[PDB]
Every structure is written in C-alpha cells, then in structure tokens.
Amino acid sequence: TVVVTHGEGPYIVDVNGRRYLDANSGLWNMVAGFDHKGLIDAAKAQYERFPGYHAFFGRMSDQTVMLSEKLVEVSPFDSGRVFYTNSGSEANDTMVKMLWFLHAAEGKPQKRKILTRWNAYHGVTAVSASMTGKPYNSVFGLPLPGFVHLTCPHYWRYGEEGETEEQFVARLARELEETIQREGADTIAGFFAEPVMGAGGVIPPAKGYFQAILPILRKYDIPVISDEVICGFGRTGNTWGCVTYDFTPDAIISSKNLTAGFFPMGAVILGPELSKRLETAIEAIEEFPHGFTASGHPVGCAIALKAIDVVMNEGLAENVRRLAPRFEERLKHIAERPNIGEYRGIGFMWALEAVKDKASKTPFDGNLSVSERIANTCTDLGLICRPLGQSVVLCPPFILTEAQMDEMFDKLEKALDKVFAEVAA
Amino acid sequence: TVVVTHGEGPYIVDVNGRRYLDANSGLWNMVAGFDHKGLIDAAKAQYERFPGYHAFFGRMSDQTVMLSEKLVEVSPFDSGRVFYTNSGSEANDTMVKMLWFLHAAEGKPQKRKILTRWNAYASMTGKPYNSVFGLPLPGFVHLTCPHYWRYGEEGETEEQFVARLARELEETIQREGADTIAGFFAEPVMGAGGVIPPAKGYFQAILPILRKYDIPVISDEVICGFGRTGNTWGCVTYDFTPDAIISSKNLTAGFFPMGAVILGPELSKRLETAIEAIEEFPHGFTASGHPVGCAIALKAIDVVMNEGLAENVRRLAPRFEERLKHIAERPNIGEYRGIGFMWALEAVKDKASKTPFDGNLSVSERIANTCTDLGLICRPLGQSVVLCPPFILTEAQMDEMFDKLEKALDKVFAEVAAA
Secondary structure (H helix, E strand, O other), rough: OOOOEEOOOOOEEEOOOOOEEEEEEEHOOOOOOOHHHHHHHHHHHHHOOOOOOEOOOOEEEEHHHHHHHHHHOOOOOOOOEEEEEEEHHHHHHHHHHHHHHHHHHHHOOOOOOOEEEOOOOOOHHHHHHOOOOOOOHHOOOOOOOOOEOOOOOOOOHOOOOOHHHHHHHHHHHHHHHHHHHOOHHHEEEEEEEOEEOOOOOOOOOOOHHHHHHHHHHOOOOOOOOEEEOOOOOOOOOOOOOHHOOOOOOOOOEEHHHHHHHOOOOOEEEOOOOHHHHHHHHHHHHHHOOOOOOOOOOHHHHHHHHHHHHHHHHHHHHHHHHHHHHHHHHHHHHOOOOOOOEEEEEOOOOOEEEEEEOOOOEEEOHHHHHHHHHHHHHHHHHEEEEEOOOEEEEEEOOOOOOHHHHHHHHHHHHHHHHHHHHHHHH | OOOEEEEEEEEEEEOOEEEEOOOOOOOOOOOOOOOHHHHHHHHHHHOOOOOOOOOOOOOHHHHHHHHHHHHHHHHOOOEEEEEEEEEEEOHHHHHHHHHHHHHHHHHOOOOOOEEEEEOOOOOOOOOOHHHHOOOOOOEEEEEEOOOOOHHHHOOOOOHHHHEEEHHHHHHHHHHOHHHHEEEEEHHHHHHHHOOOOOOOOOOHHEEEEEEEOOOOEEEOOOOOOOOOOOOOOOHOOOOOOOEEEEEEOOOHHOOOOOOEEEEEHHHHHHHHHHHOOOOOOOOOOOOOHHHHHHHHHHHHHHHHHOOOOHHHHHHHHHHHHHHOOOOOOOOEEEEEEEEOEEEEEEOOEEOOOEEEOHHHHHHHHHHHHHHHHHOOEOOOEOOOOEOOOOOOOHHHHHHHHHHHHHHHHHHHHHEEEEE
C-alpha cells in the first residue's frame, strides 16, 4: 500500500515524504543508508569506465583483481584466493561444489555430505535451500539427500529441563561426534555455519559452541566454512562473525554488506589450506574445473571496494562498536516486559522474542500473528522491522545516530505497548 | 594473464594497452559492447536516484511492474507472470523448484525428474571431478543431444536421426514413468554444450510427444534470449511454444545481474490455483525484481529490439556462415555449426573418422591462446572454439575476427602437425 521511490540516510521515504526508520537496512544490506553519495558516485564511475565483464581463468577486470587483494587483506587469512558470484545463495552452492570437486580430485569422491544446523539460512537455490534448516522447504521436497542438519545452538529454545548452557554445548558436541561416526568422516565434504544465524531469527550460538565443535571437525578433516552473508563487514562488532566467536574458518562466504546493498554480488574467500589444495588438485589433473563459470561483475567489485573503505575507514564499523552497548541496554529494559521472552544478538543485529507466558516460554498461538502485529504497528509509527517466527528483528544501518537509535526504540516500545494491550484483551 | 580495464564497442583493452576483439561478448551477455552510451547513461541515472528497495516494505517499484509487462509483451505468451532472480542460473533453479512445488501441491510429490540433454565433455572409468560443476540437480534424466554430425549413425539420414531421438524420448518416458517426470528443459540451441543447433525438425518431432504427457516444456533462453539466434527467442526461431521461459543475460546486456522466469498462461494459473489450494506461498519466489536491474533491462530490451542490434544479427549472419563454411574446408575442422550470431568450429585430427586430437594436446585451448596473442578473444569448449560476438559487430570487425582466427588455426595446426 505505501509508495516508495527512494530513501534518505537510514530512512525509507514515501511519496508524501513520511520517513520510516528502516531497521531492516533494505534487505539486511544497506549499511550505509539508501543515498550514500560516495557509494553512488563509485557505482556511476565504474559504469562510465567499464560497465560489464566476466572473469575467466587468466582473464579478468582490474576491479576483480583489486577487490580480491582487499578481501584477503581484511579476511582473517594471511593469504588465500577469491572468486565471485551474483549472490549469497550462489556463493554457498559454488563453495559446496568446489568441495565436491576438491575431495573427488583427492580420491575421495564419496566425501559429499554437508553439515549445517536447523534454523540456518544459506539461500534459495536447491543446494543452498537444502543447507537451509526451515520447515517451509518441505513444500519443495527439500532438503536434497546428503544435507545433514545438526541441532540449532539456541540455548533458550533448545536446552532441556535443568540443562545448563555448558551441558547443552557438551550435548551438541556429542551429537556432532556421533553424527560424524554414524555417517562416516570420509563421506562428509564440509560444515557451514553463520556465526550468528540471521534469517533463522538472529541467534547467537550458546557460549563456547564454536570452541567445542571446531576441534571435532578438525580431528575428522571436515572443512569449516563461515557463512558471513549477514555477519560480514562489521555487523557483530568485528569485521567477521567468525572473529567475534574466535574460530578460524577454512573459507568465508560473503554478500549484502560487501556492496553496502548497492549491487548484487557474492564472494568466497578461500583461506591458505583450501587454496593450496585446490591449486595442487588443478595442477595434478592438468585442467581447469569443468563447468566452473562463477563470476561477479566489475561494477559490483568497484562498489564493494568503496563499501569496504566506507565501513572500515569512514567510521561505520566503529559506530557499531560504540553504539552496541546502548543498543543492548535498551533491549534489556524492553525484555523486562512479561510478554518478552528474551532479547538476543550482538553488535547491530538483535531480536526480541514475544511470549504469552514468560516462565514457561510459551508462545502466543500462531493465529494471533503477534510478530506481524508488532511489525505492522511499527510501520504505522514510522519504523520498519522484520517479523520472524514469534520474534521481531532490528538490523539497522551502521550510520544510525544516537538520536535515531532513541527514535527507533521509542517507536518500538509504543508499538509493543499497543499490541500487547490489544492481544491481552 | 590478462587484466582488463575498459572497452570500446566490441573491443576490450588491458592494463598494458593491448586491445582485443572480444568475440565472446564477455560471456555471451555484453550484446551492445563495452561502451554503449545510452545504456551507461541509463545505469548511472538509476544510481543517481537509487530506489528505496526493500525486502518487504512498500509497493513494487514502477520499473519492476513495467519490466514484467514488457517481458510478457515480448514473450510468445499472450499473458503470464514473471519472477526475478540474480542470474540465469538461479532462474533455472527457481523454475525447477516451482515445478516441484506445483506437482506436489497437485498431489504428485514423486513428479520431480527433469528431462534434459546435458552431458560431460579406454583403459579408464572416468574422473568424478570433471562433471561436478555442470551436473544438473538430482533426478535429472538424460536425453541424447540432437547433434547430428556427432551422434548420427553411419549412413543414417538427419530425418532418421530425429525419428531415433523421438523413439528415445518415448522409451525414456515409459521407463521412468510420466508420473515421476516434472518437466523438460531445453536450450533451443545448446550453449555450454558447444553451440549445438538441433537436428532439422527436432522440436517438431519431440514436442507432440511431450504434449501427450503433461510434462511442462521450459525453453531455456538464457543465451538465445533477445536475438542471438536471429529472432527474439530461440523458441521462435525453431517454431515452438513453451510453457515457460528462463531468461538472464542479454536481458540487461550484461550491465546488471538479473534473471527472470516468465510463466505462460497455463503454468501461471496452476501456480495460482495451487498457491490457494495448499494455502502456502512458495518461499523465495518473487515478482519484485531489483529496480535498478529492471530499469536497465527496459533500456537494454529497447536498444536490442528497436535500435537495430537484433536486426544487425539477422543482416550479418549469412556472411558469418559463408566464412565459417570456407574455414571448414580445412582438414582439421570437422564441422562448423551455429545460427545468427552463435557459432562453433570443431577441431579433428582425422576428418573422415571424426577422430579428435588427444585430450592432452589441448587443441582448443591452444587455438584460443593463439587468438589472444593476435588480439582476438574466443572461447574453447571441448574440442571446439566458439564465437558469440556483440550484436554491434560491423562487417569490418567480423572480417577482422576471422582473419585473426584463421592465422591462429594456421599456426596451431602446423605446430600440432610437426609435434
């Protein structure tokens, strides 16, 4: 119903000039707001320069070359190799295929299974949707065979009666051990994890989770991939979610924030060990992988170069670190409400989960659509937030000021007051 | 290793100032070349006024609605629906999921297999890593590629070959069971397969068979879409009506990543009636395409259709073929094949027996590497080299392309002989 032609800073603006503070950042990607001038100028400069091309082995744009070097620099790796795609979904599919390719070239073509977690979201294509752990995919007859979903490490939801957080983490470690021993380590191509789960509802992992599961994966030679599609470039208060949870992955998947939302592109940064192994495989078999044609775009790459520079050198990632404590403190105050079951998140990605009864964690009945009601009321009050399950998510642009932060929570709290009073009746 | 900075018309230029005629149009998509001022200005204007593009808030932008109308208009369909993705490959995937969704919603969840002609390029069993990246989705069922020169039996006519492939298709449907088959996808001319136009009369023989069974027909126009075969769609040039079209590449002339699935009337209605009957809307389908992309696609479609580029393909195609015909007189060219502005040359060590050079000699690779040295870009595929230049190519530039390619063929065939 609302006609929107553009945005201004962190606001979506309708044709009448009403401003809606956008706590979805567009599609969880507009870190620099909707009209950032340096980003817009960089997009334009590249169209005038070289508006399109495709990267091949031995032939690519100067933009591809520069962004590859910049991504290795800002990755946790001292060296590595980069390729590009059009989206996070394609980046995940291609990473999976590269592992299949690699393990097959290494004489283990049965090493195919992919481990993810329930509530993970990796994309919308057949493979990345099979990696995804959501009920809605049953309507497609997904997941495909060989996509194994581990329990989601969301302690609040999945911890058993009297189970402590430490015990929960030991149980997930046991479960991983057992899944590996049952399936057979030789048949498992890789494990992919968003450090903090995004579309699953903004779920940081229980304390110690990555510290417990990484030694296990390493023991069994199962490559570890960090999906940074949402966490990447500063949203969790370090450049990468995997830094924030101190695990060293074998490769990184990136998108969204990579271009500050101004251009659809994906990137896969391969760390030193997978790069060395791929290089040796390709050398050994004496040809380039048949059918590999993944590429981004020179305009996407130029805009990404500018996005990285803005986020890192013009104060945006720093704004997230400085405002993250005030962000959390205000959430903590909101979670005092009887109908807020918990708040969770880190950096500039958070969620609030609605409950009908706090002590027992009982949700409101599905048909009441409490999340949607909250989200609709926020829109009426000039705030946009995403309803996910029984939660509402705040993932606002990194350019958010303290005043716009207050503005966001003032509106949100007025919406919660109204919705909770109204469903109470 | 070549680092490319910019282009001009159909040429690219590297960091050292070398220029190369890019006979690949980037990779099929850059149909208007590398510095088309109308398209550049239109794409710059989108950023200048970047849309309030959102995951869920606000009405679909005017550009997106307008592209959907234009796509249905220019499609062979009288009406239908459009869904958007970031690429040809994602739209392919989306169309497959859409069929899975629809057949399950109509009560046949076992209807999942996709009929396709895809295939990979002694003492040994083969290598599993050589067909990972092309491999279609699980449940694909393979039909023989209708490449007459390659697969026709000794002394078998093109007509008999097509009749043999009609039998194959019938026999395949009977063996798998029609109730387990979700659809048939086809590129009218096969692209990554090696630029393979189908044997004369192929679609006229297989379509009636597919139509006996309710196996939706999808025309994969990611390469053939918007003029490359000398008409607006490949399916138009081979005179058939699919139930849906997959589109990608030329759609924005390479200026912006986007794909589209264009559903015809019948699949549009089945989709809508199943969305209601199941009371679930399929996740990750969207009518809301990227508005910058949608605006750039409007401009690209107008350029190609109304500023003479699709017409130039039709006009220069006979000269493209004459010259290929002449090249194919060489003892080490087994054939030329193609139509409009997509063509291939196939290298052979012995013409009469269709014997290729040993894989280890990498002959296509050598041809394409020699082309680069002489200022021409062409793409090696299997034992073939492929030409798909921008639609803006002039007759002087075509001559230039072939003069360079012929010098490459001369050098490679001699080096390889003397070896």
